[PDB]
Design a protein around this ligand. Structure first.
Ligand SMILES: [Cl-]
Ligand SMILES: [Cl-]
Ligand SMILES: [Cl-]
Length: 477
């Protein structure tokens, strides 16, 4: 019966591997029956710190025979009746919660598993890549399973996880010229070693009752991209010819609407500034300027540009995702929705991985680079999504977010590194999500897409991301 293959990172470091532990456990045929058995299980529970419910759940699995050694917890000197120790092989996740939603976990074969596919004593991936690659990993009951080598960098994954400190959010870090997913993080998270090997009903219910939903893979979930998306709206207006980078628009006040038919709806901006050109609008995050430019180009020119990005497309990646959408219908049927889509609100739904893909045009002279997770996959591109002029105009303007002392990302300024960035926010029916995009413009070796949910309570993406940016400038360079 075959050994399960490993999932390893881009340097060969373990993400899902096998490890032997000395386990304390029980033998059903020696545990007794009736109240006697209940006593022996309570004795075990008291002495080794595991819940009676967990012991019973493990005892009642289908593979368990009368003579089975049933491992309960990692190992003593005074074994209660029915208890024993034994070395057993366990599936093991070295990064633990930091890569839990990506890598997933294994579990014991169910009847329903048997019904659709397998020994009752083997394991099967339940979620994540353990499930997605289960056929290649599991081998043949012989033929040991294959090793799958990912683009993930363990050190980046761990640093990208660590910045969240239980805040809900996600971080996707790519090599934007090749598409490698260096890190895919979702927060909050859960312990996959316990999910695969031993978790109490209390602990599992703590995860399921957590309103911040640690089992969700936020990097594969669709969101409004927020006002970071003005980068794409600006590139589209540049290429359409309606947005002239040096044109100085007069904009007064903190809110604007085209006319009274908008009623109580207004595009808003945070700081008073006038006149406004493309560069100051990007560095000021001026939604009004982009609302006006979106109405100026009009729906046809705006959609013509948006349609070159990957909206509607299923991706070849082994992470399940809904294709990105511009809006619910083929037409906006609303000037307000048109404008709001111009600064990343409305009915846009784009997952963090899709977002990082769309923003790759700014480091590839307007070519979009598809994401890849398996290291030896061939790089794939979509040519001329925006012009090179538009890509480089926007990327240069975004250096001001980091290098201008009034830029929102000046906290990360490094005189020896060229980093472009764009913060953003999305307002959801209210709560706000906060975003940070950064682009390595010294060597175009990394791009980061970071989001913090409910930033009214949890603070901004820029507030927590500087250690990750510092790590990348030193490591990926
Ligand atoms: Cl967490
Ligand atoms: Cl892939
Ligand atoms: Cl910014």
């Amino acid at each position: 019966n075959a050994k399960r293959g490993e999932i390893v990172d881009r340097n060969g470091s373990g993400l899902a591997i096998n490890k032997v532990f000395d386990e304390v456990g029980v033998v059903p045929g020696k545990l007794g029956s009736g109240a006697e058995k209940t006593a022996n299980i309570k004795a075990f529970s008291d002495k080794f710190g595991v819940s009676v419910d967990e012991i019973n759940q493990k005892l009642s699995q289908g593979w368990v025979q009368a003579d089975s050694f049933v491992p309960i917890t990692v190992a003593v000197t005074e074994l209660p009746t029915g208890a024993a120790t034994k070395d057993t092989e366990s599936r093991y996740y070295p990064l633990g919660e930091a890569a839990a939603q990506l890598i997933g976990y294994t579990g014991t074969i169910t009847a329903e598993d048997i019904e659709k596919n397998l020994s009752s004593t083997g394991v099967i991936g339940k979620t994540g890549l353990e499930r997605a690659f289960d056929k290649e990993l599991r081998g043949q009951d012989k033929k040991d399973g294959q090793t799958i080598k990912l683009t993930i960098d363990s050190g980046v994954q761990q640093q990208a996880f660590a910045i969240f400190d239980k805040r809900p959010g996600s971080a996707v870090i790519t090599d934007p010229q090749k598409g490698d997913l260096l890190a895919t993080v979702s927060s909050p998270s859960y312990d996959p070693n316990k999910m695969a090997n031993g978790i109490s009903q209390k602990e599992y219910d703590a995860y399921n009752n957590n309103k911040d939903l640690p089992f969700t893979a936020r990097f594969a979930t669709g969101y409004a991209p927020g006002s970071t998306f003005k980068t794409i709206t600006g590139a589209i207006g540049l290429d359409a010819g309606t947005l002239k980078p040096d044109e100085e628009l007069e904009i007064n006040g903190l809110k604007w609407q085209k006319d009274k038919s908008w009623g109580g709806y207004f595009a808003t901006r945070v700081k008073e500034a006038s006149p406004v050109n493309l560069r100051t609008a990007l560095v000021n995050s001026d939604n009004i300027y982009f609302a006006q430019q979106t109405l100026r180009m009009g729906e046809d020119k705006f959609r013509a540009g948006l349609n070159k990005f990957i909206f509607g497309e299923e991706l070849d990646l082994p992470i399940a995702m809904t294709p990105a959408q511009i809006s619910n219908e083929d037409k906006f049927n609303s000037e307000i929705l048109l404008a709001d889509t111009g600064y990343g609100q409305g009915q846009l739904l784009i997952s963090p991985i899709q977002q990082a893909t769309m923003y790759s045009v700014f480091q590839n002279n307007g070519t979009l680079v598809y994401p890849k997770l398996v290291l030896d996959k061939e790089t794939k591109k979509k040519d001329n999504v925006i012009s090179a002029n538009a890509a480089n105009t926007i990327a240069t303007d975004l250096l001001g977010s980091v290098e201008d002392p009034s830029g929102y990302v000046y906290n990360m300024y490094n005189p020896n590194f060229s980093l472009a960035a764009k913060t953003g926010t999305a307002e959801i029916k209210g709560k706000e999500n906060s975003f940070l995009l950064t682009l390595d413009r010294s060597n175009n070796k990394f791009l980061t897409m970071i989001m913090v949910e409910n930033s009214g309570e949890n603070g901004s993406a820029t507030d927590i991301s500087k250690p990750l940016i510092d790590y990348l400038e030193a490591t990926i360079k």
